Design an enzyme around this catalytic site. Structure first.
Site, PDB file in Angstrom:
ATOM      1  N   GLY A  89       0.930  -1.237   0.108  1.00 29.10           N
ATOM      2  CA  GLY A  89      -0.160  -0.100  -0.042  1.00 29.10           C
ATOM      3  C   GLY A  89       0.735   1.196   0.023  1.00 29.10           C
ATOM      4  O   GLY A  89       0.377   2.367  -0.260  1.00 29.10           O
ATOM      5  N   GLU A  90       2.055   1.484   0.114  1.00 31.53           N
ATOM      6  CA  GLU A  90       2.819   2.382   0.534  1.00 31.53           C
ATOM      7  C   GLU A  90       3.253   3.059  -0.956  1.00 31.53           C
ATOM      8  O   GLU A  90       3.781   2.304  -1.907  1.00 31.53           O
ATOM      9  CB  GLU A  90       4.156   2.076   1.151  1.00 31.53           C
ATOM     10  CG  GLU A  90       4.158   1.867   2.624  1.00 31.53           C
ATOM     11  CD  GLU A  90       3.571   0.401   2.977  1.00 31.53           C
ATOM     12  OE1 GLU A  90       3.284   0.016   2.153  1.00 31.53           O
ATOM     13  OE2 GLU A  90       3.447   0.177   4.232  1.00 31.53           O
ATOM     14  N   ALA A  91       3.193   4.503  -0.956  1.00 25.35           N
ATOM     15  CA  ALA A  91       3.099   5.098  -2.148  1.00 25.35           C
ATOM     16  C   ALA A  91       4.784   5.039  -2.846  1.00 25.35           C
ATOM     17  O   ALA A  91       4.663   4.585  -4.054  1.00 25.35           O
ATOM     18  CB  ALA A  91       2.982   6.768  -2.032  1.00 25.35           C
TER      19      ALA A  91
END
Ligand SMILES: Cc1cc(O)cc(C)c1NS(=O)(=O)c1ccccc1
Length: 194
Positions: free
Chosen positions: A102-104
């Site tokens: 999920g981390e950009a």
């Protein structure tokens, strides 16, 4: 060596289970027990093949900032064959490959590597890897727009074409290319691996 082979086949399966619980520990077990070579190319091949491997765990390992994991991510992307695939087909396959974390910054890194590989595999289709990256996210957005019933301002073909005007190093991509990407998404939503 019958006994040694049976013992190692069972340990391999144990290492797969350990990986799904904790990818670092899993890889450590396989390496220390001489079941996987501690190289970026062998670990990547293991993850690419993905036999009995949890895709979320695959993605967690591939998105880590450490030295070895970055090199594994590169090698894993290298194993994807995108030649003669349209961008959507290439994306479907890559995204099914593992669960994107999920981390950009992880996403950015993973999609850059995707974009680079797609261009390498299909020379001359896009003028830059930035064109490819931007259109990749165009395609991801279209998948949400078209297929999330809560989004009511759904882009038609004309509007999607217009959204991408000037993307190819100032030029417009062939209308037929954008239409084919549009139709592919419209026809089959991306599948997420859970
Ligand atoms: C989050 C995700 C992870 C996957 O492994 C596959 C898919 C289709 C998705 N969803 S996705 O909508 O294609 C996507 C959203 C945001 C960034 C990248 C992709």
């Amino acid at each position: 060596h019958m006994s040694k082979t049976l013992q190692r086949n069972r340990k391999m399966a144990m290492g797969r289970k350990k990986f799904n619980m904790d990818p670092k520990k899993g890889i450590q077990f396989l390496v220390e027990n001489e079941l996987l070579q501690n190289t970026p190319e062998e670990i990547a091949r293991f993850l690419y093949k993905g036999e009995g491997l949890n895709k979320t765990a695959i993605g967690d390992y591939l998105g880590e900032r450490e030295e070895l994991n970055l090199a594994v991510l590169h090698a894993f992307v290298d194993l994807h064959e995108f030649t003669d695939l349209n961008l959507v087909q290439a994306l479907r396959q890559f995204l099914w490959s593992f669960r994107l974390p999920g981390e950009a910054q992880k996403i950015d890194r993973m999609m850059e590597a995707f974009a680079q590989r797609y261009c390498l595999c299909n020379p001359g289709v896009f003028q830059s890897t930035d064109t490819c990256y931007v259109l990749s996210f165009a395609v991801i957005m279209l998948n949400t727009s078209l297929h999330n019933p809560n989004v009511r301002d759904k882009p038609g073909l004309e509007r999607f074409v217009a959204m991408n005007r000037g993307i190819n190093e100032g030029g417009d991509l062939p209308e037929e290319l954008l239409r084919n990407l549009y139709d592919s998404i419209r026809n089959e939503p991306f599948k997420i691996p859970e």
